[PDB]
């Protein structure tokens, strides 16, 4: 019928969760076409002297494979 | 004695995660009483030309059954 | 080699998820040294008249043991 | 063929686990027909001065949709 | 934005897995508007003389709340 | 060294959870030796006239293999 | 009360999913009595020239232990 | 605002499930204040000549942190 | 010494479940060699006029890496 | 077509992980034919004076049924 | 009855998996009494010039609470 | 900020678990730059005349994406 591929990316940001998700998808958009959906798998991060240093969101990203 | 019900909702927002959760709870508040707690089950969404198009937060919402 | 301990905390905030996470880490920082990493286990909360009353983020917090 | 619905209920009791389960089903019985099976999803509770204050059993309850 | 509700149904059939899924959705459409998607949660069933007696497919069904 | 075998049993009882567990273990004891440990995998059951009809505890039972 | 035993089988078939499930239950009934319920744990398989080579359905099968 | 901590305890009892849970909570309150909620993570145990020897209930216990 | 790669694909089809799986594998076969095994991760789909519109099978596909 | 059975074994060893897995398989080999594959479900063990006393590897072991 | 506590440690080693487990238990042994059992939760690590740089084993360690 | 990709590899070895892990990473470093971390997802394998024929370690390998 149709075929999609999913790739597992980790987006990171010092700002917040949305920014980390957006960083992953902004990079995905540079090389992948027909990006349709995503699913958050994990939220983790690193700690520094101010609390969160880096948010890291592990994301599956689904895109439709071109037939032609 | 007391009994609670949980319903599975999906709140959506183009703005962010908190807004998505709030959308679901805003809608629940119009028809349901004694809403007590929620649990996020998953965070999903759609992708558009500018990154995230829609955040979709799947929530379970618990409320006390009256009477 | 090195050994880390993980403790399960729940940070709360009326304003958002990042704020809830930061609350947990801010409290951890008062008594724990060599805080390194965190993992969100669950997002929960309470409901009030204006929707979300409290965001409650269940976190694992990893720190290096001296 | 036949179709069932499952509803997620939380039964509570200050007495025990069985009593919390029975509280959920006792309430379900007041308004739902053809209740058939249940599955425990979670056992939770609250703590008080004397230990457990309330047992809280999260249950999936299945009933056959009639006609 | 939009809000969706998910309901957990179990479709059954003696014919097969597809028929089981269709039974739940056929019943769902008799009362629910704006049905959009489904997610299979598990496949179970009963055993008889001939092998499978009936297939039972536990489904979550999403629809938009109007 | 030692090797253990785990087998999955379901005990049932109309009385309670402990009774269901004990039923599975009583049966295991009739034919197996060196029964050491158990792990509850799920709690399910049936619904009758007065709430719970049958408690059904799915149990993994571990025993040390002889030789 | 009653006691059931569950066993984990893998039914295989080149035809389809139902056929793989049926293969397990058919073998089960050759030696086991009072077979009552099954639960699919996973659907796996092998790949060949024509796509799916073999469907492999991992199944839990429950039967009532006889008392006499 | 508030910060809570969860500890994983295993309550045990030769009597039953509720007793194992209560045993964990009774010990917790000897030293911990602001004990609020618990969540059962698993039910395990040992087997003896009469079936269950000891029930072992793995429990997360949540309490509010002071200061 | 030898190494395999797994890739997560979603096959879709309006016919049925097997057709969805075969769709993903047929495509994989056009550009990948040494395809060996698959594992179904989930079954999802869309709803239309007459019940199921599209079956969507999420599949991991494992293949041997050359050299 | 072919039918396989999977049994859950716990291999143990005071030396290491691979030794514990090999212990389970060495035992399986004494009474079962067409042993094909294994799946590690869990790594557990006991603690002694010098750290690990015994490794205990919970394995599923699959074999093809004859006839 | 008795009450146990479980703590989650991450043992690390450049050598191997058993070494990482042992590093965690060695540190546990310095300050904790009645260490009884462990459960491996995760195996992960870092990558360097020669492949694995450090193995990291996330472990639950159970000990009996004294007194 | 930075973006990483995770790929699922299966490393194999007749020697042991660490060798299987190292086989996957050895292959990875021939074609991928900025390899950072790994997570073991599953330990599987095959059985032969002498017990374990082949250890197969299913690994997620994470690497930083360029530019
Ligand atoms: C290294 C890597 C991260 C780089 O990804 P990238 O920046 O997107 O670079 P790519 O070369 O993959 O570019 C995207 C390709 O997808 C194609 N493409 C984009 N969208 C597509 C779609 N919807 N359908 C089909 N093709 C599409 C592009 O045309 C391009 O191919 P082309 O250069 O032939 O035109 C990625 O290639 C990768 O993860 N490879 C797998 C590595 C691996 O697992 N190695 C084994 C280690 S042991
Ligand atoms: C009660 C509790 C929440 C208080 O935590 P706290 O606010 O961090 O206070 P603590 O006394 O633990 O202070 C932190 C300690 O860790 C030490 N420490 C901080 N970082 C460390 C590190 N990286 N490595 C080693 N030690 C460290 C501090 O020096 C301090 O010890 P000290 O007072 O001897 O100098 C916490 O101790 C706890 O959860 N314990 C409960 C135990 C339990 O589960 N009880 C059993 C019930 S059945
Ligand atoms: C009993 C039950 C299975 C019957 O379901 P049903 O056949 O669909 O019958 P319902 O009336 O509930 O469903 C149709 C309703 O949904 C409404 N509806 C349909 N699609 C809708 C949509 N997309 N958005 C909003 N409402 C919608 C219909 O208008 C109708 O409501 P109305 O009578 O006010 O007009 C169902 O009501 C149920 O599972 N609820 C039981 C509640 C429960 O859990 N009991 C508590 C036990 S303790
Ligand atoms: C509010 C609520 C807790 C009340 O539950 P309740 O006490 O069972 O009340 P119900 O109206 O569902 O009563 C049971 C209904 O199911 C019907 N019914 C009972 N058993 C049935 C069966 N086996 N098959 C079909 N219908 C059945 C009854 O006829 C009755 O409907 P009717 O009065 O229209 O004839 C429950 O309906 C609910 O959880 N719905 C909330 C919907 C929701 O999720 N809100 C959206 C928020 S965004
Ligand atoms: C059918 C079944 C439930 C009957 O169970 P049961 O009542 O315990 O009867 P068993 O024949 O297994 O008897 C237990 C045997 O194990 C022996 N045994 C008891 N404890 C033991 C131990 N710790 N170590 C080794 N052997 C032991 C007993 O002495 C007896 O052997 P024996 O009769 O040769 O003396 C059980 O054998 C079973 O589930 N078999 C698997 C069937 C199956 O999967 N079929 C495939 C269908 S596709
Ligand atoms: C060993 C252990 C079980 C003893 O538990 P315990 O009997 O409850 O002892 P604690 O020191 O934690 O006692 C509770 C302390 O927290 C305080 N406290 C109690 N409730 C509190 C709360 N809600 N908020 C903050 N502090 C609290 C008590 O006043 C007491 O402090 P005090 O010593 O000043 O009187 C426990 O400390 C433990 O599990 N420690 C972790 C061990 C570990 O992981 N070590 C590293 C191994 S590598
Ligand atoms: C876009 C995409 C789906 C296209 O896949 P495709 O149609 O199979 O095309 P690919 O080039 O990737 O795959 C075929 C290649 O694999 C090779 N190949 C096939 N089987 C192989 C095997 N067993 N071992 C090694 N290589 C093999 C083929 O020879 C071909 O390479 P070549 O052109 O150099 O000869 C795929 O490249 C992809 O998903 N890339 C990842 C994108 C990504 O994650 N980017 C990062 C975004 S942030
Ligand atoms: C007790 C037990 C551990 C002993 O196992 P064992 O040492 O391998 O001995 P078994 O007799 O069971 O198995 C060996 C037999 O399997 C047969 N066998 C071996 N490989 C086979 C294959 N691939 N296909 C079919 N049969 C095979 C052999 O013929 C052999 O001898 P047989 O001719 O007498 O049947 C095991 O039988 C068991 O766990 N039984 C289940 C007990 C149970 O669950 N009881 C219910 C308690 S409530
Ligand atoms: C900081 C930390 C790693 C240090 O661990 P440590 O090196 O093992 O030192 P601890 O004090 O925790 O543990 C040793 C204590 O437990 C006692 N103890 C050891 N084994 C015991 C057992 N089986 N039963 C009861 N007590 C025991 C020791 O006697 C000692 O207490 P003492 O000083 O009164 O003699 C640990 O205390 C910890 O993780 N604390 C929790 C901090 C926390 O979560 N704070 C909240 C931040 S928001
Ligand atoms: C076939 C496959 C296993 C071969 O992997 P491989 O041996 O690593 O070969 P690649 O072609 O991917 O080589 C690595 C590429 O990534 C680039 N790369 C390496 N590290 C990188 C990094 N950190 N960031 C960006 N790019 C990187 C390399 O420069 C090289 O690209 P180049 O040839 O343009 O220089 C792999 O490409 C694959 O699994 N493809 C996906 C197949 C697929 O899903 N097809 C769809 C089937 S329906
Ligand atoms: C379509 C649907 C979502 C509409 O939800 P809704 O917008 O909340 O509309 P409702 O009719 O359920 O309104 C809420 C009801 O719950 C009642 N209610 C609110 N809070 C309550 C509480 N805490 N305790 C008991 N009842 C409560 C309200 O009084 C109202 O009932 P009333 O009209 O008798 O006064 C629908 O309720 C639903 O999803 N039900 C199940 C549909 C289903 O699964 N059908 C089977 C298909 S196969
Ligand atoms: C090899 C094996 C697959 C053969 O299975 P099988 O073809 O069904 O052969 P069995 O010998 O088990 O025959 C079924 C038995 O269950 C009995 N049985 C069938 N249904 C029953 C039921 N409902 N209640 C009680 N007993 C029943 C049959 O009568 C027969 O026993 P009997 O020969 O004493 O009359 C075997 O059953 C097995 O998997 N055993 C476990 C092997 C094992 O784990 N060994 C340890 C390895 S380290
Ligand atoms: C991790 C992994 C999982 C596998 N799962 C299955 C399986 O589900 N069913 C099956 O028949 N074979 C399975 N196999 C075996 C492969 O399909 C294949 O036959 C074997 O790896 C030999 O492949 P090769 O000739 O490409 O090296 C699996 C192999 C690996 C490494
Ligand atoms: C459900 C299942 C899982 C399997 N998993 C693996 C695997 O983990 N690794 C592997 O190399 N082969 C795997 N296989 C392949 C078997 O090891 C075996 O080689 C194959 O089933 C051929 O079986 P037979 O020779 O007994 O007929 C798997 C097969 C099945 C049916
Ligand atoms: Cl068996
Ligand atoms: Na032991």
Write out the DSSP string of K12-35.
Answer: EESS-HHHHHHHHHHHHHHH-S-E
Chain F CB contacts of G60 below 8 Å: 8
Q: Which residue in J16, J44, J46 is closest to K18 by CB distance?
A: J16
Are D64 and D7 in contact, with CB atoms under 8 Å apart? no
CA–CA dist E16, G17 (Å, integer):
9
Distance J54 CA to ligand 16 centre (A): 7
Are L4 and L56 in contact, with CB atoms under 8 Å apart? no
Are C9 and H3 in contact, with CB atoms under 8 Å apart? yes
With a CB cutoff of 8 Å and minimum separation 6, the contacts of G64 are: G2, G3, G4, G34, G36
Is D12–B6 a contact, with Cβ atoms under 8 angstroms apart?
A: no
Question: What is the distance in angstroms between the CA of the first residue and the CA of the last residue of chain K?
Answer: 12
CA–CA dist C18, G56 (Å, integer):
44
CA–CA dist J44, K37 (Å, integer):
7
Is I51–E17 a contact, with Cβ atoms under 8 angstroms apart?
A: no
How far off is chain K from J28, nearest CA to CA, in Å? 24
With a CB cutoff of 8 Å and minimum separation 6, the contacts of E4 are: B9, B10, B12, E36, E62, E63, E64, E65
Instruction: Write phi, then psi, for C50 (nearest 5 degrees).
Output: -105, 20
CA–CA dist K58, L52 (Å, integer):
25
Is G51–I17 a contact, with Cβ atoms under 8 angstroms apart?
A: no
With a CB cutoff of 8 Å and minimum separation 6, the contacts of L45 are: J21, J37, J38, L52, L53, L54, L55, L56
- Residue K67, classified by CB atoms within 10 Å of its CB into exposed (0-12), middle (13-18) or buried (19+), is exposed
Which of L3, L8, L30, L33 most suits a substitution to test ligand 10, by most atoms within 8 Å of the C-beta?
A: L33
CA–CA dist A30, A22 (Å, integer):
13
Are B42 and B55 in contact, with CB atoms under 8 Å apart? no
Cα torsion C17, C18, C23, C24: sign: positive
Rg of chain I on CA atoms, in Å: 14
Are C41 and C60 in contact, with CB atoms under 8 Å apart? yes
Is D1–E8 a contact, with Cβ atoms under 8 angstroms apart?
A: no
> Which of K5, K8, K9, K10 is the mutation pick for testing C, counting most C CBs within 10 A?
K10
Considering only alpha carbons, which residue of chain B is nearest residue A63? B47
Are H45 and H19 in contact, with CB atoms under 8 Å apart? no
Question: What is the distance in angstroms between the CA of the first residue and the CA of the last residue of chain L?
Answer: 11
Return the DSSP state at C16: -
Residue A62 neighbours by CB distance under 10 Å: 20
Are K32 and J59 in contact, with CB atoms under 8 Å apart? no
CA–CA dist J17, J29 (Å, integer):
19
The CB of J37 under 6 Å from ligand 14? The reply is yes
CA–CA dist B13, B18 (Å, integer):
9
Cβ density class K40-63: b for 16+ within 10 Å, e for less = beebbbbbeeebbbbbbbbbbbbb
> Nominal resolution in Å?
1.5
Nearest to C24 by CA among K52, I30, H3, D64: H3
Nearest CA to ligand 1 atom 33: A31
Which stretch of DSSP H or E encloses residue F15? none
- Three-class DSSP category at H15: coil
Residues with CB under 5 A from ligand 16 (ion): J 46
The CB of A35 under 6 Å from ligand 1? The reply is no
With a CB cutoff of 8 Å and minimum separation 6, the contacts of J15 are: J55
* In chain L, beta strands by DSSP E: 3-13, 35-48, 51-64
CA–CA dist G13, C39 (Å, integer):
42
Are A52 and A4 in contact, with CB atoms under 8 Å apart? no
Q: How many CA atoms lie within 13 A of I18 on its CB side?
A: 19
Q: What is the DSSP string of I28-62?
A: HHHH---EEEEEEEEEEEEEETTEEEEEEEEEEEE
Q: What is the DSSP string of A48-66?
A: ETTEEEEEEEEEEEEEEPP
Is K9–C2 a contact, with Cβ atoms under 8 angstroms apart?
A: no
Q: Which residue in L17, L28, L37 is closest to K46 by CB distance?
A: L37
- Three-class DSSP category at D4: strand
Q: Where are the domains of chain L?
A: 1-67
F28: left (phi over 0), alpha (psi -120 to 50) or beta: alpha
With a CB cutoff of 8 Å and minimum separation 6, the contacts of K24 are: C3, K9, K10, K11, K57, K59, K61
C-alpha J1, offset from chain centre: 26
Are B66 and B33 in contact, with CB atoms under 8 Å apart? yes
Fold assignment, H1-67:
Dodecin subunit-like (3.30.1660)
How is residue C25 written in tokens?
Answer: 């880490």
Q: Which residue in K10, K13, K19 is closest to C4 by CB distance?
A: K10
Distance E32 CA to ligand 3 centre (A): 8
Is it the case that chain H and chain A have 3 or more CB pairs lying under 8 Å apart? no
The CB of D50 under 6 Å from ligand 3? The reply is no
The experimental technique behind this entry is: X-ray
Task: Say yes or no: G39 contacts chain E, CB-CB below 8 A.
Answer: yes
Return the DSSP state at C49: T
Fold assignment, A1-68:
Dodecin subunit-like (3.30.1660)
Are F26 and F36 in contact, with CB atoms under 8 Å apart? no
How is residue L54 written in tokens?
Answer: 């082949």
Q: Say if domain C1-66 classifies as CATH 3.90.1150.10.
A: no
Q: Which residue in H13, H27, H54 is closest to K65 by CB distance?
A: H27
Task: Say yes or no: D36 contacts chain F, CB-CB below 8 A.
Answer: yes
How is residue I24 written in tokens?
Answer: 């993903």
Are H47 and H7 in contact, with CB atoms under 8 Å apart? no
Q: What is the DSSP string of D29-49?
A: HTT-SSEEEEEEEEEEEEEET
Is E1–B20 a contact, with Cβ atoms under 8 angstroms apart?
A: yes
How is residue F58 written in tokens?
Answer: 């799915």
């Amino acid at each position: 019928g149709k075929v999609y591929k999913k790739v597992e990316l980790v987006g990171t940001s010092e700002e917040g969760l949305e920014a980390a998700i957006q960083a992953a998808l902004a990079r995905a958009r540079k090389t992948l076409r027909h990006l349709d959906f995503f699913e958050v798998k994990e939220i983790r991060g690193t700690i520094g002297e101010a609390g969160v240093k880096e948010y890291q969101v592990v994301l599956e990203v689904g895109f439709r494979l071109e037939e032609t």
